[PDB]
Each structure stands twice: as structure tokens, then as C-alpha cells.
Design a protein around this ligand. Structure first.
Ligand code: VXC
Ligand code: VXC
Ligand code: VXC
Lengths: 401, 729, 400
């Protein structure tokens, strides 16, 4: 507690879509280096030798994203060779796990100023390219009762009773709040456009957004576009044996988009911030990690959010803003139902359904989003949490400074 | 989204449209503003109209044939526009090549067979057009070449040349054999490597053969007709993609090998070609094509491209266009060529003079020792017959032109004399005064000297107006530069007859006024002296070699010092000492001469003696002499490597400026070509004169930054780096 | 803040590459075997306290992909709240997992954490994950990429270590590893690998060649991504004063390609008293550093000075040193720079004899120094590892 972790910067790239995406020609290493160079523009006279480590989350660390891409970004960007570099994978919360670990390392007293974030080029490195123990070990797939996150979301909507209209009503709500935040200029300072080697613009906006979404168009969609293979409905029901039939309510219009993107967060102690002349923007109050049943998989944010509230000695009302990655519409609807979250405090600037879910980089993106929305509202606290494959959960409370 | 360069609110038309009763459209290219087809603003708009018309009339078109109405097929682009592209014009450069490739991509995915009728040379933008077609037929006509030589101008094939070759031959083969060096192929070699599919005899049977292939392709292969291999469902790239386990094992070794062949020189074109080749093989053809454009725009706006386009296009043309040729003079044919002297230099002169269809009269002392000169001509022809580059009829008529002899009377008809006996000014005076009366009054009397002035030698002839200095390099069969030294008595006609002779034997001529060391030998002296100066100052000899190779030189300096005897450097260091000490002037010795004399005292004169800065066994170079570090206390002075690279490049650049100031060189085009092809000045600079106007470093870019860096070197390494007043205000 | 102790530290034996005993074992089971061994040692342990499982893996692909730490948590039947994260810092992945676990406990927001590594190099070879620095020419060109094998030879050329100097060390590592196995130093921490029926698969480090002779090492031919042209000329373009690289490293003086895994339990003092666990060693300090990426393996030298500076200690106060034996010249330079006593360095042999299971080597040479500090009744040890890309990690522990 003696050394508190602060957030000095939090930037991210625009999220390019999967098919005909604008970032498909850009290597995921180039996405991280651009964010490093942007932090150089904002602080040209920073002693980068104070930067002790770079931590990047990545769920598919193979191919373009293999070989410790955090260390490749340190060398390619020209940072001091002493600035470390480590890649970690905790599925969808790899970006937030990097921010939390960088905060825990600052508190431990053995790190002064650490960069943390994530990168994921799902159009170049599709999800599942990194192999996996499941499938390559049928004895393990059979024993743990593997069910992909798509069915788990449909199972949550069946148990809690979320209709197709209920999940599509949230999808439209996420699209509307994203377009209002964008045209309002909320993301002007954080979304660093991507440029080529000649300076030409490649992308500057979240192109997965469909701001002209209507209730009727969301009803014309079709569900579940691995999930279309047989077995997973029966495997999930053999675990949740009281459910008779799974209602498939999720489509590409109410599920998180497959996008490319990356994000960076500069974290350091109060002493290091004064040494380099940096102004802190937020404080890492508490971090927590828990998990829920591995078959429904997506649940897990709830016991982790409650764990991070008890660690910081706070309640739901003490937290001004709540931010949960919109992997699926029913997951956020259950999260609001369990902890009784007001509508106005939940994913206020839209979420992954409209702008995308760059797996390894999402945790660092939505966190940086809450840093801006706290300053823009002059609010105090915010709670960031993510559902994770396998059944895990990660939460983090930040307080505006 | 458009096939045209503009899309808002008047050039010529290059392409003719010919559809026949079958439905085969024949696109014949014919640029009315030049005898060669070229990729300018007229073509892009002309092909834009043709491609748009192919789509709107596709319901009545069966196939396309692309031919040219010129003696060549297609060659290059508008260099006068590309050399002006600025970094803020990268958006325009990007859009232009993207427009060029969208045209070829529509023509390629037309659903109908497209055949290229290559009637002649297809280079750069020409082969890139033919690569978009599905079939290629070339005529085995004389003078026809095929290749992508954009890398020789600091560029890369940006019209699909990289995307398609890496996709036809794989990453490794396309880069090595076609892209990295821009190798030019004759049609027989091109059909073997895969660039060309069929061959015909004359250009008359090209369009009929192209239409005959379209008719047969539609019958036998109706589905795959007009479909390139990479647009098929089961395409597999040769050698595999970067995802393949076999290629990804050796893929990290490609950039390291490129740093070996370039020795670390700052030449960014092969770097961008290798980067666009690999990153392109990871995505689809259309995304790969756009990555190629971004790397292309990165080179066109750069300075290294502007340096090469200046030297290898504009400066080389102005020389071959007769710039250094005296005005208004005509030609006098060279009937018989008397090559006095039949040593190493004398043999190469007679060979290239015989390979140009001229009669040679090789003359020397010993008919036995003068047979080695013709034996050197047969050693080459026998190697050429094995390589298939010449025929026995072409090889016998060549040796028949050479008339080895030893009689002075066998000069009744000779009108051109080259002396390459050996070097001694007094001995030169007497041997010259022999054939002057035997030859006709219009007979040139040349001389191959490296440093001895011509005007002093010209006194030993009556017709001093025909005494000239033709300086060849070793070996004469391969070195492309010929340094013509103009004396005080040489006339406008006698110089022009030598200028015409050089172009006839296929070499590059530069005209130099009489001076000590002239230009080539004088500038290359400052390069080796600056390195030996660094060796005496205490710099590691390995660091000196790495500085010379990473600068872009062909041979490192300490190695080059052993190839031209150290005592030969000492002799010139005395001839120059006697030269200044006779005009009432004192002589300041270069600090390198203390190193030369220290090596000569130690008995290490270079390669001939068998010991220099390197050690020599089995005729090959072993390694640096291990006692060299102890002799010159290597390691005491450790300057940064960039200062060593600059000390060697600035010494030659400032010496070139002193030559242009003293009237030794007339134009800057000769200074660039003379430095690039004569002594090996790095091609990325574009010449020792372009290096000044095209300098680039932390001090900026241009003549002013060059002066700043030259003064920065002056304050730390000596006042020989202070720039002349001609570069100042 | 809160102190982080080591309560348990075990590791599997290391099976060799060619015709290895562990080739048929999935790298997931190498970890599950170690989790079941911890359970056997502490049956009454409440596994709901274990808040994370942090595993190091340099090639997280295929058998080692999909967050093998989470697969270890689920397959072993651990509580589903016990997390599971895989990280990758090249050779120091095994030590960085322990350092991160100790740092998470020091921050206070974690009570009890498992940390370790796993690498089945006979099933998932090195460089199987692709890589950005390797399979992208624009970066390979600018950063002047070069393998560790070339950088190790360059260290021997610059420092003057002859072929006999590095082969004499490999003999010393073979002898200390054979003498340690005989004395049963490893009998308690080396958990033999078994199958689903209880049959023995491997109970010893089979890469060891204990009958190695100085004469036999001399006949080995130098193995210098090498044997592919370029990397010699690239290194000399940056080290322009060196003329030629003296290739002194062979397969006998370099670390061995092996399969293996290691596990280290870490927790606060309150987590130990509450679970009835005996703290064995205390994480005193950690550090991250690095050096030139073309010489690569000189990162341990500034990382050891940075960690001795945090603990306020000196080389004298460290009873046992433990540097990973990736290449013999790297350990010799480390001994020369810091003037390390000869009888303090890699006292039980190193990766040359037993092997280098990349992602797990950090947690193996740490658990080795916990065993030795107890057996010798010594006080402090220091563990460091060289890293590809020119990094370095070091950790100081103290016996309790
Ligand atoms: O900008 S244009 O499309 O007119 C153009 C530019 C350079 C060249 Br070479 C050809 C055409
Ligand atoms: O902007 S320019 O018109 O100078 C231009 C130059 C080269 C190319 Br290719 C395209 C355009
Ligand atoms: O024919 S070349 O490939 O050497 C070529 C020349 C000029 C330009 Br602009 C492009 C290409």
C-alpha cells in the first residue's frame, strides 16, 4: 500500500473489422509500435531508461504475434534494450491482466514505470490459431466438458430468461451510445489513428460500428455464425441438466465483433511520475481475480467484481461507473441483474458489440475508456471487469485523480 | 474505385483498339510522343479507357491480345516526373501505382484469356504488364530483353512485379533471381526460368500465334481459361508461404543474407523488395498488391532513389548523347587498330577492339610473349563458347581481326594507336617516336597512363594534335569506363574520334583535361590515404574495413591497398613530390605515407610480394596480418563508425569538387559516372558530385548540410575536410 | 510490503530430445503430475486459497497453446477460481513466473500463488510459434537479428575463451551433476513422471553424459538458425573491431534440448500459518535488465548488479550463485566480470548436463538452490538467466 500505482496515459488504436478490414495489411507489431511512438510525441523528453518493463496481452501468440511480441515492440520501436518485454495470455482479460500485473509490480517496489497493454490482429491471426490443449487432448476436452463461449451465452439467456428482443435491445443500446460518444468527441484524444510508412492514413475510426442500427434489422439476423458443429448443445445440457432446451438468441448483431486493434497504458509510482514530470490521471485502487463454472464459461465477472469491492472496502453505489466487456448481450444483462446495476452506469460509451473485441487488447481498451469518461464527467470511481474463456474473471477499480 | 488517375473536372492516346469477328480484342500500344512505349500519364489514361471498354463489352469479347507497334514492347516510366516526387507527394505516388495495378487486376481477372505479344524489350513497367496476362509469347529477335530492373534506380517493381513474381516462383527464387538485382534476360533464358511461355522466330507471327493460343485454350481448358494459378481454389505457392514449416525454418536467414551481399550498405531498395515479398505472401493478392504500393512510395520519395535516377538515367544518357563530344565534329571510321604493347592491359584493349568488329594489329617485342595477348583473347572466347554466349563463327572472325605481329611495317592502313607498354616517361618518349611516320596522317596516337601527364609526352611526336591519353582499367574486358585525357595540343577532331571509338567498343567515356592523377587515379588516392591515416591514428584495422564496406564501396580500403602495390603508391607519392618541388612549391606529405613506408620497411608491399595488411597463401587472401595491431597500436583511437564512413566518403567528394574547380572535369555527369564506374564510388550516392547535393544526415540534407558535416569533420580530424569556397558564400 | 516465501518447489526429470522418454507425454500432464505431487504432500491444504497459476512457456503453440496454465487448473481438478495465466519472456519465463507470483503476493492482493514453467521441446520445438523478429524482414533487417549461438561464440572471441576453456567448463558441469545425483541431492524435489496406470516413465535427468572426457569433447564439431549464411557477417557489422568469430561452442558445451516442467508454491506468511506450511526460503529481491541484442547473453551481468543493489548486498554476502548454462562462454564471462569464486558457481551442475527446458528452466534452477541452501545450511543464493533478444532477470532468496 505504501507505493500506489497510478495511470499516466492510456491510448488505443481504432478497431478495424474482420472482412475487408482496414488493418488487415498492418502487422500487429506495427500497431504496438505506433502506440509507443504516440507516447513519445506526448512526452518527448522522457527518460525511457526509467521504463522497466513492457507487458502485452495476446491470446493467439503465434505467427505475426509470436516470439514475445512485447520484446519485439521494444526493439522495433528503438526503446532501451533494458526495457524488458513479456507476453501473457489469460484469454479475453489478457489486456487487463497486464495492467493489473504492472500495477502489482509497481506496488511491490521492484518496478518504477511499466508499460502495459495488449494487441490482437484477429484478421491475420484468427482465434484458435495458437492450437490449444482442447482438441489436441480429447481426454481433457472430454473430462472438462468443453463448450465454446457462444453456447454459454445462449445458456445464460435461457436460464435468466432473456428473450431475443432482450439481447437485441441491448445491442441497439450499445450501437447508439457508441455513435454518440464518437460524434461527441469523447474518443478524440485516446484513439490514435494508424498510419503507414509514408504517413498516409490507414484508419482513424472504429469501422465495425453500424450506427444506423434498428430494432427490425437486428431481428432479421440469424444465430451462431465451431459452434455450428454438433455436440456442444448436448454437452452443455449434460452439465446444466435442469435445462431442457437452449434458446439460441445471439447473432453477429448482439455479439462482440471480431476486430484488429491494440492498446497501451503507462503505469508508474507517484515518485516516478514526478521525476519525469508526468501528471497522474487515475489510481489503481484494487484488483481481483476469481472464476465461475467452466461450462457456461462466460460467468465469472460477478464473483470477481464482488471480490474487488471487498478488497477496496467499497459497495456498488460507491462505484460511479461500471464497464464490462460486451462479449455477448446476455452476459452484460445478467451482470446488471445480479448486482442490481443501474442502466446509466453500465457501458456508458458503448462496447464491444458496436466497436469490437480485440481479445488480448480489450482489457486495456475499456480501461482507458473509463479513464477518459471519469475525467469528462468529473466522476470518482469506475469498475472494469471482463468475462473470460475457461471460466475466469478479472476486475479492477480505478479512482480519478 | 476508379481506373483513372483523376475523377473530377487532356493527354494523348497510346492504345489502339482492334476487335475481330471472333471477338478477340487486340490492344496495340503506340505512344505517338516517342519511339518507345513507356509508363507515363498518357498510358495510364489510355489503358483506363481500354479496360473500361473491355468490361462494358465483355458479353461479346472472347479474349485479349496485348502487342506494341514499336520495335520494343515496353520499357520504363517517366523518369522526369518520378525524380521530383517529394515526401508530401506520397499520397499521389500511392494512388498512381494503385491505379496502374487496378487496371492490370481487372484485365487479369477478366474471365477471358489474355496473351502478351512481346515483340521486343519488355522492361520494368513492360514485364509488369505481361505478368498480368495469362500467356506470354516472345520473339527470339535480336536485342530483346526481359526483366524488372527498377532496383537499379533505387526503386522496386510497383506495378505488380513483386506481387506476381513472388507468387509465380515463390519468395526465395523470385527475389534472388529476378527482383533483388533486376537481372535482364534474353527470351531463351526467360522461357527457361518461367517468365515467358512460348517463343517464335519473327515478330510477324506473334499476333497470329497469340490468337491461335486463345482459340485453343477456350476449347481444351474452358473453365481455367483466363484464370491465373493464384486465383484458383487450390493454389499453393512454390516453396510454401511464410506459414509453411519448411520455409519458416530458413525465412529468418533471408534478411541476414541480404546484409551479407550488401555488406551493410545503406541501400534501401532491396530491403523494401524483401519486405514487400514476404509480407505479401502472407495475405491475399489484393492486400499484397497494396503493401507493394506503400513500399514503392517509400522509395520514390526517398533520396537514395533520386541519387540513382540522376546517375544511371540522366547522367548516363547525357554522356552517351555526346555531351563531352566536341561540337559539330563528324566521324572518321577506324579501319585498323594498332595496339602497341601486349601485356595484361594490352591484351584487353585488343579483345574489346576485336569484339567490336574492328581490325586489330597487336604489336610487341617477343612474338612468344606477344602470343599471351591473343591467348588471353582465346581464354575468354573459349569460356564464352562454353557459356553459349558466342558462336564458333563469331569467335573465329573475332580472333581473325586480331593480327599479332612484331613488324613496324605492318601499319600501312592503321589510323589508331594505343600504347600500353609500361610506365616510364623518358622510355615512353622514345618508343612513341617510331610509328608516327609509318601510319597515315590521320592516325591517332594514344597512351594508357594512370598519373603521368600527357602534354609532357606529347613533345615526342610531330603531329601533337593527334597525341591523346586513353586510360583503361583492369581488367579491360569487364571495366566499363574509359578516361580520355585531353592534352594542350589535342584538337577537337582527334578527341571526337576517340570518343566515338569508346562507344563502339561498348564502354563509357569521360573527357578529362591534362593534370597530375587526372580524375580517377587522383580521387581514389584520397580514399586509400584516408584509411591508412586512420590506421596510423590507432583505429582497429577491422573497423577500417567495416567502415569501407558499410559505406558501399566494392572493396574495403586496406584490402584495396594490397591490390595496388604499396610501393606503387610510394612511387606516385614521390612523383607528386617532385612535381610540386619543381614549380617552386613545397609538398605536405599525407600522414598515410608514414604508414606506407612503415609497411615497406617491414617488407610487406602488398599482394605480389605475398604480404601486406593481409596475409596471402594459396594465391587467396587469408586474413589481416596479426602483427598489424601491435605495429600501429590499434585500439588506442576508437572513433564512432559513422565518422570513419564519412571520412572516406568526404575525402573523395571534396577531391571531386577540387577537380571541377580546376577544370579537370567539365560537367558533373562525368564526375558521377567517373566515380561510380571508374573507382567504385558507392552507387547509392549517385556519384561523388551528386553526393554533395544529395547528402543526408543529422545535420540535414543538401549542400548546406554537406558543408556543416564537412566542417564538423574538419574540427576533429584535420583541415583537409574544410570545403572549398565554391560550396560556400 | 508483504513478504513472499517459497513453501514448495518441485520439478520433473528432464528427458532428452532424440529418443526421449518424455516424448510421449503431453506437456499438460507434466504440469498435472506436479500438481498431484503437491496435493500428496499437503492433503489438508485448502486449494481455494490458491488465487492464480502462472506458468512460463516460450513456445505457447499446439500442445502448449490455449493458456496451458488454465488447462492445468481444469484438468487437475483444482478450484475453478484458481485462475491460470501463461507468460513468455524467453529463457527467463520460468523465473519471471516466480518473480511475478512473488510480486503479486507482495502487492497484497494475492495470498497463495502457484508459479512455474513447462516446455516439451521434443514435441514443440523452439521457434514453432513463428515470431515477429524472425519471420518479418523489415524488423529482422533493422534490429540486426542474430541467434544466441552466434552471440555466445562472439563472447568467447572477445573475451579470449578458447575451445579448451569452454569445454573444460562443460566437463565440470557434467561432474557436478553426476556427483549431486549420487548424493541424493535431488531425490526429494525430482518427482518421477508416471502414466495413467502408475507405471514409471522417467525418474532421472537422462540428458546427462556423466562419463564425459576432455578428449571426447574435443572431437565434437562446432554447431555454428546457424549453418545458414549471414549471421556471422551481421554480428561483425555491429562489432566492427572484431575480425572473425571463433566458433568454440558445440553440442557438448551448450545446454541440452529436453522436456520438463517445474512448479513453485509462493504465499504470504499468513497463508503459510493458516494452511500449516513450513516456509523454506524468502524472495529477497528481483530485477530486470538487458544488454546489446546482437551479443544477447550479456544481460545477466547488469541484472545481477541491479538485484544486489536492491537487497543492499554484495557478491560476498551471496553464498551460492546459479546462472543458467545456456552456453559455456556465457557462464565464464559472468564469472570473470563479477569475480565469482569458482566453488560458488552452479555447484550442482547445470543445463549443459541436465538440459534447458526453456520455459521451465527458471523454476528448476531456483528449486535447486532452495534444496542446496537447506542441505548446506547456507543463507543466501542468487539465480539469474540470460535471455534471447538481450534481456536479463535475477532473483535473490534467503533460507528460512
Ligand atoms: O501522377 S500521374 O498519374 O500523372 C503520373 C506520375 C508519374 C508517372 Br512516371 C506517371 C504518371
Ligand atoms: O506527385 S508526383 O506527380 O510527382 C508523382 C510522382 C511519381 C508517381 Br509514381 C506519382 C506521382
Ligand atoms: O525500365 S526500368 O525498370 O529501369 C524503369 C525506368 C524508369 C522508371 Br520511372 C521505372 C522503371
Amino acid at each position: 500500500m505504501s507505493e500506489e500505482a497510478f495511470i499516466y496515459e492510456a491510448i488505443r488504436t481504432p478497431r478495424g473489422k474482420q472482412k475487408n478490414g482496414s488493418l488487415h495489411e498492418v502487422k500487429p507489431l506495427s500497431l504496438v509500435v505506433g502506440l509507443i511512438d504516440e507516447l513519445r510525441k506526448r512526452h518527448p523528453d522522457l527518460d525511457e531508461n526509467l521504463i522497466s518493463d513492457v507487458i502485452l496481452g495476446c491470446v493467439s501468440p503465434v505467427g505475426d504475434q509470436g516470439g514475445d511480441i512485447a520484446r519485439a515492440a521494444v526493439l522495433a520501436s528503438g526503446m532501451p534494450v533494458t526495457s524488458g518485454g513479456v507476453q501473457l495470455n489469460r484469454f479475453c482479460a489478457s489486456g487487463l491482466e497486464a495492467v493489473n500485473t504492472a500495477a502489482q509490480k509497481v506496488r511491490s517496489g521492484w518496478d518504477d514505470l511499466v508499460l502495459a497493454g495488449g494487441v490482437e490482429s484477429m484478421s491475420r491471426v484468427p482465434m484458435g490459431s495458437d492450437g490449444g490443449a482442447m482438441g489436441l487432448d480429447p481426454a481433457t476436452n472430454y473430462d472438462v466438458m468443453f463448450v465454446p463461449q457462444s453456447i454459454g451465452a445462449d445458456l445464460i439467456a435461457t436460464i435468466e430468461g432473456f428473450s431475443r428482443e432482450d439481447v437485441d435491445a441491448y445491442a441497439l443500446r450499445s450501437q447508439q451510445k457508441a455513435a454518440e460518444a464518437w460524434s461527441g468527441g469523447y474518443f478524440a484524444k485516446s484513439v490514435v489513428p494508424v498510419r503507414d510508412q509514408n504517413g498516409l492514413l490507414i484508419l482513424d475510426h472504429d469501422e465495425h460500428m453500424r450506427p444506423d442500427t434498428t430494432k427490425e434489422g437486428l431481428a432479421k439476423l440469424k444465430p451462431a455464425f465451431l459452434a455450428a458443429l454438433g455436440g456442444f448443445d448436448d454437452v452443455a445440457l449434460q452439465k446444466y441438466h435442469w435445462v431442457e432446451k437452449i434458446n439460441h438468441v445471439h447473432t453477429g448483431g448482439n455479439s462482440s465483433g471480431i476486430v484488429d486493434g491494440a492498446a497501451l497504458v503507462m503505469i508508474g509510482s507517484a515518485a516516478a511520475g514526478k521525476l519525469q514530470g508526468l501528471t497522474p490521471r487515475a489510481r489503481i485502487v484494487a484488483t481481483a481475480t476469481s472464476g465461475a463454472d467452466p461450462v457456461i464459461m462466460l460467468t465469472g465477472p460477478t464473483p470477481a467484481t464482488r471480490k474487488v469491492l471487498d478488497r477496496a472496502g467499497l459497495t456498488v453505489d460507491d462505484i460511479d461507473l461500471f464497464e464490462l466487456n460486451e462479449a455477448f448481450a446476455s452476459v452484460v444483462l445478467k451482470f446488471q441483474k445480479d448486482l442490481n446495476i443501474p442502466d446509466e452506469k453500465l457501458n456508458v460509451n458503448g462496447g464491444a458489440i458496436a466497436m469490437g473485441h480485440p481479445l488480448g487488447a480489450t482489457g486495456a481498451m475499456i480501461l482507458g475508456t473509463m479513464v477518459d469518461e471519469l475525467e469528462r464527467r468529473n466522476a470518482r470511481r469506475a469498475l472494469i471487469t471482463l468475462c473470460i474463456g475457461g471460466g475466469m474473471g478479472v476486475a479492477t477499480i480505478i479512482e480519478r485523480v | 474505385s476508379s481506373h483513372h488517375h483523376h475523377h473530377h473536372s487532356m493527354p494523348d492516346n497510346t492504345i489502339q483498339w482492334d476487335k475481330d469477328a471472333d471477338g478477340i480484342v487486340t490492344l496495340t500500344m503506340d505512344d505517338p510522343s516517342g519511339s518507345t512505349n513507356v509508363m507515363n500519364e498518357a498510358y495510364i489514361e489510355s489503358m483506363g479507357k481500354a479496360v473500361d471498354r473491355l468490361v462494358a463489352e465483355k458479353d461479346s469479347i472472347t479474349g485479349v491480345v496485348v502487342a506494341s507497334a514499336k520495335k520494343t514492347f515496353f520499357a520504363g516510366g517517366d523518369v522526369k516526373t518520378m525524380i521530383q516526387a517529394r515526401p508530401e507527394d506520397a499520397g499521389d505516388v500511392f494512388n498512381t501505382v494503385e491505379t496502374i495495378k487496378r487496371q492490370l487486376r481487372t484485365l487479369e481477372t477478366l474471365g477471358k484469356p489474355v496473351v502478351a505479344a512481346i515483340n521486343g524489350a519488355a522492361l520494368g513497367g513492360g514485364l509488369e504488364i505481361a505478368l498480368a496476362c495469362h500467356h506470354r509469347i516472345a520473339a527470339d529477335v535480336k536485342g530483346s530483353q526481359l526483366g524488372l530492373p527498377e532496383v537499379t534506380l533505387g526503386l522496386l517493381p510497383g506495378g505488380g512485379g513483386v506481387t506476381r513474381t513472388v507468387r509465380m516462383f515463390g519468395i526465395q527464387n523470385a527475389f534472388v533471381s529476378v527482383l533483388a538485382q533486376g537481372t535482364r534476360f534474353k527470351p531463351a533464358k526467360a522461357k527457361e526460368i518461367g517468365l515467358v511461355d512460348e517463343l517464335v522466330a519473327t515478330v510477324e507471327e506473334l499476333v497470329p500465334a497469340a490468337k491461335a493460343w486463345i482459340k485453343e485454350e477456350l476449347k481444351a481448358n474452358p473453365d481455367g481459361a483466363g484464370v491465373q494459378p493464384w486465383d484458383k481454389k487450390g493454389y499453393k505457392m512454390p516453396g510454401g508461404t511464410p506459414s509453411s514449416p519448411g520455409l519458416a525454418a530458413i525465412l529468418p536467414s533471408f534478411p541476414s543474407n541480404l546484409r551479407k551481399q550488401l555488406k551493410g550498405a545503406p541501400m534501401p531498395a532491396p530491403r523494401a523488395i524483401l519486405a514487400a515479398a514476404v509480407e505479401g505472401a502472407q495475405v491475399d493478392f489484393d492486400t499484397a498488391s497494396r503493401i507493394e504500393s506503400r513500399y514503392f512510395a517509400s522509395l520514390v520519395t526517398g533520396q537514395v532513389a533520386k541519387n540513382m535516377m540522376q546517375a544511371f538515367f540522366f547522367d548516363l544518357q547525357a554522356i552517351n548523347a555526346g555531351g563531352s563530344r566536341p561540337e559539330g565534329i563528324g566521324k572518321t571510321p577506324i579501319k585498323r587498330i594498332g595496339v602497341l604493347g601486349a601485356g595484361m592491359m594490352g591484351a584487353g584493349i585488343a579483345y574489346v577492339s576485336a569484339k567490336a568488329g574492328y581490325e586489330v594489329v597487336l604489336k610487341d617485342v617477343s612474338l612468344e610473349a606477344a602470343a599471351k595477348g591473343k591467348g588471353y583473347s582465346e581464354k575468354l572466347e573459349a569460356k564464352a563458347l562454353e557459356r553459349g554466349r558466342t558462336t564458333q563463327e563469331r569467335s573465329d572472325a573475332l580472333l581473325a581481326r586480331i593480327t599479332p605481329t612484331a613488324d613496324a611495317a605492318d601499319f600501312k592502313g592503321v589510323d589508331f594507336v594505343i600504347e600500353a607498354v609500361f610506365e616510364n616517361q623518358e622510355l615512353k618518349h622514345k618508343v612513341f617516336g617510331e610509328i608516327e611516320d609509318i601510319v597515315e596522317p590521320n592516325a591517332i596516337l594514344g597512351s594508357n597512363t594512370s598519373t603521368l601527364p600527357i602534354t609532357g609526352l606529347a613533345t615526342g611526336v610531330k603531329r601533337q594534335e593527334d597525341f591523346i591519353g586513353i586510360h583503361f582499367f583492369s581488367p579491360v574486358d569487364k571495366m566499363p569506363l574509359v578516361e580520355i585525357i585531353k592534352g594542350e595540343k589535342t584538337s577537337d577532331e582527334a578527341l571526337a574520334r576517340v570518343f566515338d571509338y569508346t562507344l563502339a567498343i561498348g564502354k563509357t567515356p569521360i573527357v578529362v583535361n591534362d593534370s597530375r592523377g587526372f580524375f580517377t587515379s587522383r580521387v581514389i588516392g584520397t580514399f586509400v590515404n584516408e584509411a591508412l591515416a586512420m590506421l596510423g591514428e590507432g583505429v582497429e584495422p577491422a573497423s577500417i574495413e567495416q567502415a569501407g564496406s558499410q559505406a558501399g564501396y566494392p572493396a574495403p580500403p586496406l584490402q584495396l591497398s594490397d591490390e595496388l602495390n604499396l610501393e606503387l603508391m610510394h612511387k606516385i607519392a614521390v612523383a607528386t613530390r617532385k612535381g610540386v618541388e619543381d614549380a617552386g612549391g613545397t609538398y605536405q606529405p599525407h600522414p598515410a605515407e608514414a604508414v606506407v613506408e612503415k609497411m615497406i620497411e617491414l617488407g610487406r608491399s602488398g599482394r605480389l610480394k605475398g604480404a601486406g595488411f593481409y596475409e596471402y597463401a594459396d594465391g587467396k587472401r587469408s586474413g589481416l596480418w596479426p602483427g598489424l595491431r601491435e605495429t600501429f597500436k590499434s585500439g588506442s583511437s576508437q572513433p564512432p563508425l559513422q565518422d570513419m564512413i564519412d571520412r572516406m566518403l568526404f575525402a573523395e567528394a571534396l577531391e571531386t569538387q577540387k577537380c571541377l574547380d580546376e577544370g579537370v572535369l567539365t560537367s558533373t555527369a562525368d564526375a558521377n559516372i567517373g566515380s561510380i564506374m571508374g573507382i567504385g564510388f558507392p552507387p547509392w550516392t549517385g556519384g561523388s558530385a551528386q553526393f554533395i547535393v544529395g547528402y543526408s544526415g543529422p545535420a540535414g540534407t543538401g549542400k548546406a548540410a554537406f558543408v556543416a558535416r564537412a566542417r564538423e569533420l574538419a574540427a576533429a580530424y584535420g583541415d583537409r575536410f574544410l570545403p572549398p569556397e565554391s560550396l560556400l558564400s
